[PDB]
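Exercise 7b. Backbone tokens:
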């Protein structure tokens, strides 16, 4: 229509088919997640938001999905990221040791998709979904990501890495998912160091972005959780990926 109920994009075309297909592929690739029934997962996921008002979703709504999507990941190999999506995933596509949330079953199913239902009916709304800013915070997509991102951060131990976009303006932004949920769910009992990799834009010869005021902020915040802080510039992200793909050979 010309009006729409909400300000955000509607459910992604082919959402149900896409989620199911992502689950078959994932559980096919990963030997640990081979016990999972992808139809059961879909039913659990749909159950969280179908016939529910899309401004009144809770983390409780996603409990059935979280249960079915339970996955042990090596706690010391987690890669968090903020606003530098492409390079973070290119990295874990080549360095199969480190994992982002989108490399877990639940993150993989949901990545880049939008979904919402209706309080009015049992249908999926393909026309519009609540915008976190203009409409309401407690919507199906926002609540999903808050819940899974908290649980992922809680799982981390030892040295946790985070890729940050050095071209942003707030390189560390306290209002990002990284800054507002994940930083505040790293467990002091478990996490030894948070190490940031600050990815430079282009150009070439830049400042040491590890001295940026927002990085000092992040450093002092995580200090309260009794977590040590490390920071590295990645001045040349292209050479960096090349080095990840071809380890050894002196250039790297
Ligand atoms: N739509 C989403 N909303 C909130 N968090 C998300 C979303 N998609 C992924 N995440 C989580 O955010 C992480 C990426 O961290 P930041 O870049 O720190 O997150 P941010 O930039 O705040 O993303 C919020 C999201 O809402 C807006 O619609 C925007 O388009 C972006 O997709 C994790 O990989 C994932 O845990």
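Sequence design result:
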């Amino acid at each position: 229509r010309w009006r729409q109920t909400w300000s955000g994009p509607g459910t992604t075309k082919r959402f149900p088919e896409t989620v199911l297909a992502r689950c078959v592929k994932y559980t096919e690739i990963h030997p640990e997640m081979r016990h999972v029934d992808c139809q059961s997962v879909w039913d659990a996921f749909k159950g969280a938001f179908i016939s529910k008002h899309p401004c009144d979703i809770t983390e409780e709504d996603y409990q059935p999905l979280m249960k079915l999507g339970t996955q042990t990941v090596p706690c010391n190999k987690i890669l968090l990221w903020s606003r530098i999506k492409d390079l973070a995933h290119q990295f874990t596509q080549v360095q199969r040791d480190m994992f982002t949330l989108e490399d877990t079953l639940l993150g993989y199913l949901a990545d880049d998709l939008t979904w919402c239902g209706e309080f009015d009916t049992s249908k999926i709304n393909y026309q519009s979904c609540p915008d976190w800013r203009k409409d309401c915070s407690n919507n199906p997509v926002s609540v999903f990501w808050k819940t899974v991102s908290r649980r992922f951060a809680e799982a981390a131990c030892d040295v946790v890495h985070v890729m940050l976009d050095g071209s942003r303006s707030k390189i560390f932004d306290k209002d990002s998912t990284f800054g507002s949920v994940e930083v505040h769910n790293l467990q002091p009992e478990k996490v030894q160091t948070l190490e940031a990799w600050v990815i430079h834009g282009g150009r070439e010869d830049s400042r040491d972005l590890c001295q940026d005021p927002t990085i000092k902020e992040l450093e002092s915040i995580i200090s309260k959780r009794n977590i040590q802080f490390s920071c590295k510039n990645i001045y040349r992200p292209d050479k960096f990926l090349q080095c990840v793909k071809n380890p050894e050979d002196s250039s790297c």
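Instructor comment: The first strand starts at residue 8 and ends at 9. The pocket of adenosine-5-diphosphoribose is lined by residues 81-83, 101, 141-142, 145, 149, 176-178 (CB under 6 Å).
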